[PDB]
Design an enzyme around this catalytic site. Structure first.
Site, PDB file in Angstrom:
ATOM      1  N   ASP B  54       0.889  -1.166   0.196  1.00  0.00           N
ATOM      2  CA  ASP B  54      -0.047  -0.202   0.007  1.00  0.00           C
ATOM      3  C   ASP B  54       0.854   1.373  -0.110  1.00  0.00           C
ATOM      4  O   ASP B  54       1.200   1.742   1.055  1.00  0.00           O
ATOM      5  CB  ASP B  54      -1.255   0.131   0.906  1.00  0.00           C
ATOM      6  CG  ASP B  54      -2.551  -0.624   0.526  1.00  0.00           C
ATOM      7  OD1 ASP B  54      -2.859  -1.554  -0.364  1.00  0.00           O
ATOM      8  OD2 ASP B  54      -3.461  -0.206   1.620  1.00  0.00           O
ATOM      9  N   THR B  87      -4.698   3.885  -4.838  1.00  0.00           N
ATOM     10  CA  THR B  87      -3.708   4.629  -4.292  1.00  0.00           C
ATOM     11  C   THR B  87      -2.604   4.885  -5.396  1.00  0.00           C
ATOM     12  O   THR B  87      -2.281   6.038  -5.812  1.00  0.00           O
ATOM     13  CB  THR B  87      -3.285   4.233  -2.964  1.00  0.00           C
ATOM     14  OG1 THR B  87      -2.791   3.158  -2.735  1.00  0.00           O
ATOM     15  CG2 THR B  87      -2.337   5.331  -1.938  1.00  0.00           C
ATOM     16  N   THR B  88      -2.089   3.777  -5.360  1.00  0.00           N
ATOM     17  CA  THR B  88      -1.131   3.168  -6.364  1.00  0.00           C
ATOM     18  C   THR B  88      -1.445   3.335  -7.841  1.00  0.00           C
ATOM     19  O   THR B  88      -0.808   4.403  -8.143  1.00  0.00           O
ATOM     20  CB  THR B  88      -0.400   1.560  -6.189  1.00  0.00           C
ATOM     21  OG1 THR B  88      -1.206   0.837  -7.073  1.00  0.00           O
ATOM     22  CG2 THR B  88       0.878   1.624  -6.373  1.00  0.00           C
ATOM     23  N   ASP B 358     -14.640  -2.140   2.555  1.00  0.00           N
ATOM     24  CA  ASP B 358     -14.562  -1.872   1.122  1.00  0.00           C
ATOM     25  C   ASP B 358     -15.497  -2.350   0.122  1.00  0.00           C
ATOM     26  O   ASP B 358     -16.036  -1.450  -0.504  1.00  0.00           O
ATOM     27  CB  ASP B 358     -13.106  -2.209   0.685  1.00  0.00           C
ATOM     28  CG  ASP B 358     -11.876  -1.561   1.526  1.00  0.00           C
ATOM     29  OD1 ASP B 358     -11.812  -0.773   2.386  1.00  0.00           O
ATOM     30  OD2 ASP B 358     -10.915  -2.451   1.173  1.00  0.00           O
TER      31      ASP B 358
END
Lengths: 491, 491
Positions: B54, B87-88, B358
């Site tokens: 992450d 995010t990546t 999520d």
């Protein structure tokens, strides 16, 4: 982009740092496993100087630098608290493993693929380790004393082994209720000077660390009713302390062990009546003397009473190699039994104390699994020639996984040859050939004469929870450590 | 003209500083997204060692140098507060995008130009990402499980994906009011040991980690009227503390959970009548017990009273994995629901709890938005080939920029190829070719066999919340960051 500690290493740079760390502390540990190795001398910091061969400790002391190299203590550490045996094994083959996983990663493998081999060759390995397994069931005595002897090898005395694996099988065969739960706590090990290795005996009861209080109190009782007080026969002087002593001799004791002491003038009353008493006695003390003698453990000395109270077949204070202790034999219903160990120095007594504790452990493994393997290297070569032939079944990159992970199973049977100044590639051939054809059992690396042998008919053999845990917790530990590719360092 | 600390960079000087700062960053975290991504090992000054995949806390920690470089955690930071996912994404194709915008900048051209392409290629991107749309209805089951499992991919278990997804869609489809809106706080996530992957369940109610205050209290109530007493049941010893208890048994509490708890004497009053109680129970297990049972949350105890009062079918204190917990099932009107979750350790649990949360955020947006798409690179390659023939459309500078923004979208899909260690060249033509043709749900890149792939017809597919925000947030970040072109510096 970063800050706080930062010098950063992927890919090659990475390889180097995690291979050198893991290779290191393997080399460390390579030559300490089994009959063919050897001793190490630590020194820290406090300039303190410390000989040991056994792998956990060995990496404990040595304050480490490599964080990656710190995650590997962790994998010897969780093999000692659990099973014990195989520290050594889990780890070493955890560094070897990795060397071999280098040759690949230099073939630019997708670290991806090499793991996809050594997982399916962990798994399969389970299906292998389970069949070479030469089942002999749980309370058969023969084999109990072949699992017990292997509990006692490479040790300052494997000699004893036949007298240290007897009163052991009698002491765990005597503890466990409902065949298939396997209790340690129960078997104490006392260590006194004078004897030889074979004069170790099993008193069906409790041998504590205890004088006679009052010099009054008869130095031996016949059919005795031992009391247990864990709590006070102290009150302050005259009266109180007399009312506590004339209520023990009211109920039915001759024998008394109190976890909470005695005054002067209260042992003078105890010995007035023919009551012996044992002062300061530890709560370790207490529970053993409870199941020895037969006792229900009380609070205080003021509830002490013949009924919560024991039956015991001899009780003398015996001075044994210049120290007084209290014996408690002929025990009616021992759950839990003490084995007197005669002995050398404290060092060969202690050890025959640890050559029972890890013997009772390891047989509490042939309760719950009454499997038995593989006389050290044995099951390795078997796993060898199976899992090689397994490989011709996979295909792709995972070919090259599982082949490498077999051929590194030959690490351990190898070093125990080399350490032994032996030709490896002759024996290897000898053992492999003799394992595909004899079985589980038959197929060994004996150190001594140097040739394949029945660890079975020796037997020389070890429990099965030992081999199982040592290989799994190791194998998956070094594929974690496999897989971090990026090291940003710092303190 | 410029203080203290000084140093000043444009063009050459500048472009290299920025770009560097850009690219490093990215290089870092590229190899972490998808099936195929590898851990990282941080370390600060403090000494603290740290293992994470992450993007956000990656760049959080690693205390970074360059203030432009600082503008770059801001852009993974926003992406995590909102959705989480991605995010990546935002980032990596933020710094790639910058690499290719170098080639042209050294082309001389007019940043002004480069940007001018990238904003029209954003906006036409929008038009493409809402067509590759394979549109279902929101409270359907199929595509609810697909959303569910693509919330549960590259993770700790991905495994129990199909079991993980079942009890999350029945937990969401029981929350929602007025099919529009998709609340999260109503789904608690309780973590205990014992089980496998697939056996986690959906208690139509609330399960708290509190055991019975008072060991008289009946250990099991049938048709029970739960109370909710946030108050103090605290008064001074004696009396005031009794008429507080005698007011519970007046009402019709069987069953009572207090946000502030219970003294002493009060317990043993509770426990004297038949009244169970749970002491220092948070504001969190307040709220959800409310919805659970059906309660209206109240001020004090002294209010705790029959009507403000609940209806639960089942309330037993059941030791699970070791540990004793209060169950509260049979729940008439759960608006809001616990979802009991069995694996492994701590760790497999707390992941299934995060693979649900999520999963309740991305089913809160196909409620949102009505709408599905194809993971790991259907949408990317489909944008590719369309935005490519949208170039030959545009004319000018803008040309040049729209091409370079498509061929940038080949980024992600291709790395996840390389990382599987496959050949990217042959795949990307297979999935392009497959996607023109078949459709928006079906042209994929499965790492496992290696080949182009019906996302849709496997069940690997992702939300909309998801691809929408991650491409917006990221595109217009890393062309803003293009457009500073002077750097005067100070400490």
């Amino acid at each position: 982009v970063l800050p706080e500690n930062m010098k950063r290493y992927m890919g090659r740079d990475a390889q180097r740092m995690n291979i050198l760390a893991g290779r290191i502390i393997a080399e460390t540990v390579r030559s300490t496993l089994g009959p063919k190795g050897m001793d190490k001398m630590l020194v820290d910091d406090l300039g303190d100087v410390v000989v040991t061969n056994d792998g956990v400790t060995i990496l404990r002391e040595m304050s480490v630098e490599h964080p990656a190299a710190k995650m590997l203590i962790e994998v010897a550490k969780t093999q000692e608290k659990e099973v014990g045996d195989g520290t050594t094994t889990a780890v070493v083959v955890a560094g070897e493993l990795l060397r071999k996983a280098e040759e690949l990663l230099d073939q630019n493998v997708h670290p991806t693929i090499v793991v996809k081999g050594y997982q399916a060759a962990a798994q399969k390995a389970q299906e292998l380790l389970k069949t070479i397994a030469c089942e002999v069931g749980a309370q058969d005595k023969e084999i109990l004393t072949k699992i017990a002897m292997t509990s006692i090898t490479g040790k300052g005395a494997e000699k004893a082994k036949e007298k240290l694996a007897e009163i052991i099988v009698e002491a765990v065969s005597a503890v466990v209720d409902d065949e298939g739960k396997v209790d340690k706590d129960l078997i104490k090990i006392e260590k006194k000077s004078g004897a030889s290795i074979d004069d170790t005996e099993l008193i069906k009861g409790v041998l504590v660390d205890k004088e006679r209080v009052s010099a009054q109190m008869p130095k031996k009782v016949t059919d005795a009713k031992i009391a247990l007080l864990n709590c006070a026969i102290e009150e302050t002087a005259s009266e109180m302390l007399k009312d506590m002593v004339a209520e023990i001799k009211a109920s039915g004791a001759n024998v008394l062990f109190c976890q909470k002491g005695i005054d002067d003038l209260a042992q003078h009353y105890l010995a007035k009546e023919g009551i012996v008493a044992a002062r300061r006695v530890k709560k370790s003390d207490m529970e053993k003397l409870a199941k020895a003698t037969g006792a229900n453990v009380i609070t205080n000395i003021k509830d002490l009473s013949a009924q919560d109270l024991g039956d015991a077949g001899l009780v003398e204070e015996r001075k044994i190699s210049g120290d007084s202790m209290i014996f408690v034999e002929e025990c009616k219903h021992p759950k839990a039994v003490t084995m007197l160990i005669r002995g050398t120095t404290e060092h060969v007594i202690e050890e025959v104390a640890r050559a029972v504790d890890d013997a009772v452990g390891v047989v509490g493994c042939t309760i719950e699994d009454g499997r038995i393997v593989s006389g050290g290297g044995s099951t390795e070569v078997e796993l060898s020639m199976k899992l090689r032939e397994y490989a011709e079944g996979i295909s792709g990159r995972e070919q090259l996984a599982v082949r490498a992970f077999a051929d590194a199973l030959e690490v351990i049977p190898r070093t125990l040859a080399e350490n032994a100044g032996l030709d490896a590639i002759e024996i290897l051939v000898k053992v492999r050939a003799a394992h595909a054809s004899n079985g589980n059992k038959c197929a060994g690396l004996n150190v001594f004469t140097g040739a394949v042998e029945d660890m079975c008919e020796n037997g020389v053999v070890e429990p099965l929870r030992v081999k199982t845990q040592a290989i799994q917790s190791a194998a998956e530990s070094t594929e974690m450590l496999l897989r971090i590719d990026d090291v940003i360092a710092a303190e």
